[PDB]
């Protein structure tokens, strides 16, 4: 309930009405994505995570819980991602990249040459549960 | 009298006060030590035989290691 | 007294010489109403080099819009005789 004083990130201003901003952005996103063909994996994935984040935003009235439930950083960084998705939606509509070409070909390599434990390796850890739900929803 | 124009030699003369003679080499260069702790216990010096026109390359190889703390053996022990 | 324009009679000969002096131009087809492309056997690249020579001669820049309108001698002449920066 307490107003956030700082995000600790230089140039990222605190957004006091983050809940109202996020609900607006997600609702706008769920309309603009309908210009994409329904069979495209981009449209499916975008709807999947926008809906869950919207449902969380609707349920919780305290931005601290919204941050806690989503696990995706501060509400100000959630607003940035929501704005960027809306921008990407506009570009992808204009680009028209949809559809598989006639003589489509794609080589896939899965190289299993191991690397030592000691060399640098990114190991971020498990993502929030929705990422895996989105992925398995895309597979099916 | 070299101390008046040559201040580098004077610093060695002053630091020589209270020092111990370790040895003399073939060229006449004299080697001194203090056994204290001012520059982290590093108190090895050479007083070159020539009070003028001295040069660092005049230290023989037997004493070069001692002077640079590379070894604890003096030039005499190495030669033996 | 002052003046802003170079007399036309002074301009025609100056354009007449620089085309004669320009190579690939025999000084016999150089009638003052000649076309660099049709009457002078000059390609487009040679024609571009002629307007450049006149710019330097009269000391002033000629815009692309008007660089193209100078396709003949009489046309190059008129433009300079009425242009006040020509000096």
């Amino acid at each position: 309930a307490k107003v956030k004083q700082t995000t600790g990130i230089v140039g990222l201003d605190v957004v006091p009405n983050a809940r109202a901003v996020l609900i607006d952005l997600y609702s706008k996103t769920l309309k603009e994505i309908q210009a994409v063909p329904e069979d495209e994996g981009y449209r499916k994935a975008v709807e999947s995570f926008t809906r869950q984040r919207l449902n969380v935003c609707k349920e919780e009235e305290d931005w601290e819980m919204i941050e806690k439930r989503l696990g995706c950083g501060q509400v100000e960084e959630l607003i940035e991602e929501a704005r960027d998705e809306l921008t990407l939606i506009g570009k992808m509509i204009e680009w028209d990249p949809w559809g598989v070409p006639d003589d489509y070909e794609c080589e896939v390599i899965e190289n299993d040459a191991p690397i030592p434990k000691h060399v640098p390796q990114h190991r971020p850890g498990p993502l929030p549960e929705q990422f895996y739900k989105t992925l398995e929803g895309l597979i099916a | 009298m070299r101390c008046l124009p040559d201040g580098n030699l004077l610093q060695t003369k002053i630091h020589n006060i209270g020092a111990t003679l370790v040895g003399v080499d073939k060229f006449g260069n004299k080697y001194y030590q203090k056994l204290g702790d001012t520059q982290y216990g590093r108190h090895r010096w050479v007083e070159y035989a020539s009070k003028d026109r001295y040069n660092a390359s005049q230290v023989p190889a037997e004493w070069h290691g001692w002077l640079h703390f590379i070894t604890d053996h003096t030039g005499d022990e190495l030669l033996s | 007294v002052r003046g802003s324009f170079l007399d036309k009679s002074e301009v025609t000969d100056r354009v007449l010489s620089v085309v004669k002096n320009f190579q690939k131009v025999d000084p016999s087809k150089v009638t003052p109403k000649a076309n660099f492309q049709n009457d002078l056997g000059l390609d487009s690249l040679d024609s571009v080099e002629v307007v450049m020579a006149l710019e330097e001669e009269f000391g002033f820049e000629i815009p692309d819009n008007e660089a193209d309108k100078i396709q003949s001698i009489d046309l190059a002449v008129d433009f300079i005789a009425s242009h006040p920066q020509a000096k």
Binding site: - | - | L45, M52, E55, E56
Partner: protein, 112 residues
């Protein structure tokens, strides 16, 4: 300002060729002042070398190659005006200001 896309046809390429030649020629007085060439060469000789360069490449039919040549010419010209590397009878890469060739080459060395 930015690098333009590759020319669609030889009309677009030629418009660009003409544009470059105009810029190269319009910088000639600046070059003459920088290298102090008033008593070495005439400005038209500078113009002839530029038009020569262009005429030696009149057999190119691919607009992509023409664009690359124009880009390299623009780069070469910018260095000559901004970062002059003065050499007496040489501006950039341009020399400014009874026996056959075999016997001369034979007299010189064994490598022709």
């Amino acid at each position: 300002i930015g690098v333009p896309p590759n020319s669609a046809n030889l009309t677009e390429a030629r418009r660009r060729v003409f544009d470059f030649f105009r810029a190269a020629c319009r910088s000639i007085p600046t070059i003459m002042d920088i290298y102090n060439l008033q008593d070495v060469v005439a400005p038209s000789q500078l113009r002839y070398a530029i038009s020569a360069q262009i005429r030696n490449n009149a057999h190119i039919t691919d607009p992509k190659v023409i664009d690359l040549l124009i880009f390299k010419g623009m780069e070469e010209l910018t260095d000559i005006v901004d970062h002059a590397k003065q050499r007496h009878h040489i501006i950039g890469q341009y020399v400014v200001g009874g026996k056959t060739d075999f016997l001369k080459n034979f007299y010189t060395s064994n490598y022709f």
